[PDB]
């Protein structure tokens, strides 16, 4: 019937805190120990590092 969106994927790299346009930029690139998805955190995120959350698997962490 209706096509699923989850089935499809995109390369939209944005900040985990807000959503800065740091796609393919020199931002904080790390692999989530939960899923392993490439997480890009802008410089500003450095301050929010105290408490982040993986936007991929909705994994809320410190």
From TrEMBL:
Domain of life, source organism: Archaea
Annotated Small zinc finger protein HVO-2753-like zinc-binding pocket domain residues: 15-58
Annotated Pfam families: HVO_2753_ZBP
NCBIfam families reported for this sequence: HVO_2753 (NF041909), PRK14890.1 (NF011481)
PANTHER family from the UniProt entry: SMALL ZINC FINGER PROTEIN HVO-2753-LIKE ZINC-BINDING POCKET DOMAIN-CONTAINING PROTEIN, ZINC-RIBBON RNA-BINDING PROTEIN INVOLVED IN TRANSLATION-RELATED
Protein name (record): DUF1610 domain-containing protein
Native source organism of the sequence: Haloferax volcanii (Halobacterium volcanii)
Organism lineage string: Archaea, Methanobacteriati, Methanobacteriota, Stenosarchaea group, Halobacteria
